[PDB]
Structure formats: C-alpha cells, structure tokens
Write a protein that binds this ligand. Structure first.
Ligand SMILES: [Mg+2]
Ligand SMILES: [Mg+2]
Ligand SMILES: [Mg+2]
Ligand SMILES: [Mg+2]
Lengths: 248, 248
C-alpha cells in the first residue's frame, strides 16, 4: 500500500486512488508523507475516508495543519473537523488562530453547536498546561452505581470515549471522588458498588498545572491516564500519556 | 502519612511504624525518600508489606537497588524479589550483576524455579533493546476462541498480567497473528470469534530492536503496549509505554 499509491497519484487514477485509500493505514501514509508533492497531499486529505484524514492531519505540524484547514473545501473541512478528538481539534484551531484569527471564527462556525461550544471552553486554556492537553471525552460514574450498570454504560460510551480503561468517579456536583479501572470492573462481582472498588486517593492535576508536571506525574506513577479538575474540584477532563510523550 | 512516619522512625515505635506502612502509598514514600537516613531506608524496606517494597525498590536507582539486594536479609530478599514484575526483576538483578556477579547467582538461586528460569532468558538480552525492556507477563489467545472464552480467561489471568487492555493473538507455533483490545472485547458479541475482531496488521518489534526505535514506534502509533517477537516471529513479550517514558 506504500508506493502502490504514488502509482494512482502520478497517474490520475481516481478509482485506484480511492481504493488504496480505503485501506491505507494512517501511519503508513504519514511515513511517505515527506515524499509527496503539495498537490498529492491535498488530494489524499480530500479523498481519504474522513476518520483517517482527521487522524493524519492530527499528526502533522501545526503549520501544515493550519494550511490545510485554510485550503481544503468547507464541505471537506466540515467532515475532517468533526472526526478529530476534542483535544486535537483545539490544537488544530489554535494553529489557524495564530495565523488568521478571523478564519478561526469561520472554522468554529462550521462545527456542530455541541462540538463548537466544547472546543471553545478548551481552546482557551493555556496550551502548555493541563487544560490545553486534556479532552472531555472520558467516562465518569457515581459511586452508588453497580459494576453491572457501569459495564452496561461503558459499552454505550465506548465509541466516543478517549478511553474506558480508567473510569473516574464523581458526585452530584461533578467533583472528583476517585478512580477505577476496567480491569477491576472485569473481575468484580456485577452486584458490587463502585465505592467498594474505587481508589479514593486518586491523583489528579489542575487545569493550569504545567505540562512538565503532568509529564512528570504520569512518569512517576506510571499512569496512562490522568484526571484534570478546575478550581472547584470538578472533573473537567483527562490527559492521556500519548499526548505527554509528545510534549517529550 | 508523610512526615507522620518519621515520627515512628525517630522514635523506634515499631507498632506505629508498621501501621503507617500498611497504608503509605509507594509514591508518597518515594518522595520523602531523599530525606531519609540510611538506617531508615533499610527499616522501611524491611517492614513494608512485600508488594509495596518491591514497588518502591523498582523505582530507585540501580545502584541503590543493588545495595539493598546485597544488605537486606535473604528471607526478606526472597519476599521482595518474588513481588517484582519480571522486567523489573531482570533490571534489579543486572544491577547487582554489574557489581558482584557471584551474588547475582545467589540472588537467582533464592527465586522460585519457575521465576528463576524466566528471568534468565530475560536478563540476558541487551538491556537497551526490546528484550531488556519487555516482560513475558502478557495475555495471548488463539483466533478460534470466542469473546466469552477470552473474557473468562482474562479474569483468571488478570492478577499476574502486566495488562489485559491489549490481548495478542498467536497460533499453534506461538507466532504473532494479530492484536486485540479489551475495549473491542467488551462491546463484541460473546459468540464472536477473535479472528473476526482482531487487527491482523499488528505492529511489532524485535528482541534486538533499539530502545530508541521502541520509544519512537510507541509515540508515533500512540500505543500504550507493543509486542516483541524473536527471530522466528514468535511472541516472547510486551513493552509498555511507562517503561518507554523512562528511557526518555
Ligand atoms: Mg491542545
Ligand atoms: Mg489526545
Ligand atoms: Mg530491563
Ligand atoms: Mg514494566
């Protein structure tokens, strides 16, 4: 699928192109990416199935990110943007914002209202602090819920969640009460309460906490996921280790 | 629980000491660790519940690791060592080996035969290559197994596994056929075959692959777990991202 693409490209074989794009793995494409003329990068980001396109763009430089969000057709932008994880959308928007703040406003208007309001709260936080790294696509439950109710829930929430391997616990006010893992859930009795299984001394970070600290905290405790709260102690999101590895 | 310890320490209050150690979190202890006299580091590694002691020692420098494996009583060493994850045991043994190869042989003899043979294959690989980072404590299944059989299996394997969030697939010969996630398993129908759910294009690494490459591969694909094979394409272990974060 590697060069077997530049075959469809140099040729102008749309049929063959679309076919290779249906199964080309995002990383396989991100590889030979420096070896693609400008015209070809544009066509691929156009014809690629939207989810993969979002994936690719999410891994490009922010200057490249901003250039394609400014040159790709609005119908296509609509598609790519709605496929981005929230934290990746914010970074992609902030990329454009830096260059053209007016078009940033346009990009946000192309979003679905539910999506648009979410990024807005996000895109604001300092981009080198917990808020600028986190995503609100986590799973939270109450401590009164049983394991059976949570597992049932997770199957429903899985498709959109950043992860379901770490499940946070909150109260009526939305404040962090503890942490739970999919592993514990899987071995526990379906009748067991979540409070009888959670770890009440969950370690967390603030929305303004420096990214150095988030990285250090995640390396020390060996977490793959860390919760992020606001000034009122309420769960507002999670940071995952893949995004910490990138901060280096 | 922080300084509330140095209280039992400076006093010589074994009862109080053991009590604080029953609930002192490993990282909470690893913190005020530079602020502990030699005598106190020794007592804590002695009285701490074995699992936590293994945890603490696993995070100390390799020179400190080797000094305590040479000064702690054999009955206690027996306990700590059997609580270490395999990859951590190998590194702890290699630490001592560098200083005193003879005592390394003693340390290995204190292990349980099943444990001893396992570390031996491990402790040999280059410690800056996949082999020197991996652990054989992963979960593998066949592609003919159903989801129900795998979930049943995982509950049984959970307690010792490094993780059960990524389940590898092998054949009769033990060679890597694909990868699967706990997430997919949870949403899939219990009757579904594993081959109808796995990703056949699993990305993997060799036992001799450089650790730079393991880190890069894990950062690019955003994996939290990567499989490691030998020269015959057989699954011999996994590397987890927490150990890659440490390689920096
Ligand atoms: Mg961001
Ligand atoms: Mg992310
Ligand atoms: Mg090692
Ligand atoms: Mg490990």
């Amino acid at each position: 699928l590697a060069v077997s693409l530049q075959e469809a490209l140099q040729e102008g074989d749309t049929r063959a192109l679309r076919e290779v794009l249906e199964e080309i793995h995002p990383q396989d494409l991100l590889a030979l990416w420096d070896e693609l003329k400008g015209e070809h990068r544009y066509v691929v980001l156009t014809l690629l199935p939207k989810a993969k396109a979002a994936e690719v763009l999410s891994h490009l430089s922010p200057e490249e990110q901003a250039e394609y969000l400014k040159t790709l057709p609005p119908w296509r932008l609509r598609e790519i943007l709605e496929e981005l994880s929230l934290d990746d959308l914010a970074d992609a928007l902030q990329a454009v914002r830096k260059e053209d703040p007016a078009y940033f406003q346009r990009l946000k208007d192309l979003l679905d209202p539910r999506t648009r309001a979410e990024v807005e709260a996000l895109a604001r936080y300092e981009e080198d602090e917990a808020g600028g790294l986190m995503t609100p696509e986590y799973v939270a439950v109450r401590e009164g819920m049983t394991v059976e109710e949570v597992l049932r829930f997770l199957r429903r929430a899985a498709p959109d969640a950043e992860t379901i391997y770490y499940i946070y616990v909150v109260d009526e006010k939305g404040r962090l009460k503890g942490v739970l893992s999919l592993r514990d859930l899987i071995v526990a009795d379906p009748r067991t309460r979540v409070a009888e299984i959670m770890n009440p001394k969950v370690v967390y970070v603030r929305t303004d906490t420096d990214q150095e600290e988030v990285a250090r905290l995640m390396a020390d405790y060996d977490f793959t996921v860390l919760p992020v709260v606001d000034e009122e102690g309420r769960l507002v999101g999670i940071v995952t280790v893949d995004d910490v590895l990138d901060v280096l």
